[PDB]
Amino acid sequence: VLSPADKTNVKAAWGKVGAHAGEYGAEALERMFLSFPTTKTYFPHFDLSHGSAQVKGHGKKVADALTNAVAHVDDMPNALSALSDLHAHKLRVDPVNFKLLSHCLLVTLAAHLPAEFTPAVHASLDKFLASVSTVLTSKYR
Amino acid sequence: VLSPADKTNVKAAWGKVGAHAGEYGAEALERMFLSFPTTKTYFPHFDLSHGSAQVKGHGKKVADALTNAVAHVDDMPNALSALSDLHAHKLRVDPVNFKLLSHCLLVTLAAHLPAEFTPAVHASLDKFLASVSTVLTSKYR
Amino acid sequence: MHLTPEEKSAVTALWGKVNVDEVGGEALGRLLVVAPWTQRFFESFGDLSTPDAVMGNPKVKAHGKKVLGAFSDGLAHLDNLKGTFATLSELHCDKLHVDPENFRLLGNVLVCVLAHHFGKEFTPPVQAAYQKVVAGVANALAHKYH
Amino acid sequence: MHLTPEEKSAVTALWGKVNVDEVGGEALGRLLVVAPWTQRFFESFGDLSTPDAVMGNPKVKAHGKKVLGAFSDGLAHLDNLKGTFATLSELHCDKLHVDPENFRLLGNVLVCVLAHHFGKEFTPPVQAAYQKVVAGVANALAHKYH
Ligand code: HEM
Numbered sequence A, B: 001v002l003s004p005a006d007k008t009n010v011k012a013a014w015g016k017v018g019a020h021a022g023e024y025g026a027e028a029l030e031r032m033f034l035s036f037p038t039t040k041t042y043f044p045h046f047d048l049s050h051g052s053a054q055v056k057g058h059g060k061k062v063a064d065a066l067t068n069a070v071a072h073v074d075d076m077p078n079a080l081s082a083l084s085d086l087h088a089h090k091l092r093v094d095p096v097n098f099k100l101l102s103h104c105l106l107v108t109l110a111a112h113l114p115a116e117f118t119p120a121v122h123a124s125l126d127k128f129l130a131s132v133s134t135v136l137t138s139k140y141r
Numbered sequence C, D: 001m002h003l004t005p006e007e008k009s010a011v012t013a014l015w016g017k018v019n020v021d022e023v024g025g026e027a028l029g030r031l032l033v034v035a036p037w038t039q040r041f042f043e044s045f046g047d048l049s050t051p052d053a054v055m056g057n058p059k060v061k062a063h064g065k066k067v068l069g070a071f072s073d074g075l076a077h078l079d080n081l082k083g084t085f086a087t088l089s090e091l092h093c094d095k096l097h098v099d100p101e102n103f104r105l106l107g108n109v110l111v112c113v114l115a116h117h118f119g120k121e122f123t124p125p126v127q128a129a130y131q132k133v134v135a136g137v138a139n140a141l142a143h144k145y146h
């Protein structure tokens, strides 16, 4: 579970993301594609070339969802229900891939927020991404 | 989430284990130790040789806890509070390992309950061990 | 593989007793039931609405036999699983879009099927060698993903 | 170790700019903070109660430098990691009893640390080379477990 501290941390670090969320979302994806090529199997229909608008488009949607979980940090299961449904029933992404994206999102944030990416914040963001992943995977079986 | 069919199937299967759960507990550990030698890192203080009383006893302990779980299939979180505590704050076994014991336990039931280890029963027991694993690692952070 | 002659012999000798026809259909069908999400690749097979319906589906059984066949032949190149599954690895990636994690789910089901079948015969030391083979197969098959 | 020459040059160029003393302390300290369970191996290190207590503990800093020291040597034998890490693998297994999954966790944390430090310089493709490397090292560290 996320503690008050964690919650503060996440709102704070994400606060700083502001308007770059979209771009950071696109970048996390590209990092993921390059470091874990197996994740590509889920996007056979995408142009995964560098600067692909499909990826930009997708990075933004991922970023809006993360942004929505932060706004509803106290009711994530309900704020993300729909996306939980989609992932369980339609996309059926294997669970191990959430940790990969989580990881690439953390690298991205670290690469952009040197001042905020403190040990304490890193830990909070990690627990958060893990909780988001848990929600998205909750209805799998 | 365990469906009613599932809770039924589990209670049946476990129902047939009977006086042998302890031996199955012991056998699963032995299969785990041989197939996934990395799991041995958690028992440096045990004699891990075939037929060790340390292993037999531990086998019983595990077996018993599963029994208790089947019995409170409706309230696992609660029936296993203490155990989730122990694992999260004292043992601190890494989560990957739960999947390995769960698998050696299926193999063991399969090898001992032929008639009963139907495809639907197999699916159920699996979800079940999954649920149990989730419960035992829920307080990790 | 990092199989011991002793380990090689154990694999080899149990295999000798396997009915690939029966074991292939049961391993694949069990998979479709235990891990329902692997059904995403077999929509064209029919109704997999129930254990019964999966276990009964001939398309399933026949795919299962094609799979264990290929696996079976891999057991003859235990010292170069990589070279034996190269083309099958590309195919799975490039044509079928099968997530390699699936290869690991099946392997574990395979092991439950063998135990199911051989009871006593499938001892801890024998499962241990089989676990190494199933991991080895999965790795080989995943090797060409990019 | 599927390090393309271009991947190996890239690993090597950046490693050129690292202050192993510094990075070592940050990586280690950060691990104890993000995955507090890992603190199990260091109860003789003293106070790890808070991030500051961990990050600043002279013992963590000194140990981190040791670890990265060994890792650095590893990078000069990218061809033979297994060889390089052999006595260390034995030690972690036989004396320390460290579950190898620990090696992968540290690799990921390390990657985030490099991203943290290099910002924009830690490009998608540089990250992918480091992914292969942390993985090679973890595997080399786990090679002697039994
Ligand atoms: C916390 C992590 C994740 C979040 C927040 C997230 C969120 C989303 C959202 C908002 C969408 C678009 C739904 C729509 O069309 O409105 C989406 C689609 C999708 N996601 Fe997830 N996702 C996550 C993890 C993953 C992972 C790990 C993968 C696979 C590696 C994945 C694969 C997909 C695919 C294939 C689609 C559909 C894309 C398309 O066809 O346009 N997702 N996700």
Ligand code: HEM
Pocket: B039, B042, B043, B058, B061, B062, B065, B066, B083, B087, B091, B093, B097, B098, B099, B101, B102, B132, B133, B136
């Ligand atoms: C199926 C899930 C599991 C259950 C129900 C379970 C249950 C138990 C029980 C009942 C105990 C004994 C508590 C006591 O001594 O009072 C125990 C202890 C322990 N468990 Fe877990 N366990 C599970 C999974 C694991 C796994 C996968 C590992 C590591 C591979 C593990 C490692 C340990 C260790 C090291 C001990 C203490 C042994 C000793 O010093 O006696 N457990 N567990």
Ligand code: HEM
Pocket: C038, C041, C042, C063, C066, C067, C068, C070, C071, C088, C096, C098, C102, C103, C106, C137, C141
């Ligand atoms: C033991 C590991 C496996 C082996 C050796 C294997 C081997 C094969 C072979 C030999 C084919 C024949 C196709 C051809 O030559 O055109 C095939 C096709 C296929 N496999 Fe795999 N397979 C394995 C695992 C899996 C798994 C786990 C899945 C999905 C759960 C899967 C999905 C498929 C599909 C969807 C096809 C195409 C069937 C069709 O054309 O209708 N495979 N596989």
Ligand code: HEM
Pocket: D038, D041, D042, D044, D066, D067, D068, D070, D071, D088, D091, D092, D096, D098, D102, D103, D106, D137, D141
């Ligand atoms: C890149 C991976 C790692 C490398 C290269 C590495 C290297 C080292 C070295 C050089 C030593 C000292 C050897 C000696 O005392 O003779 C050491 C000790 C130790 N390592 Fe590792 N290590 C790694 C990962 C880890 C991880 C992830 C953990 C725990 C989660 C860990 C736990 C320990 C412990 C507990 C000690 C002994 C500390 C003491 O003196 O009390 N290591 N390691």
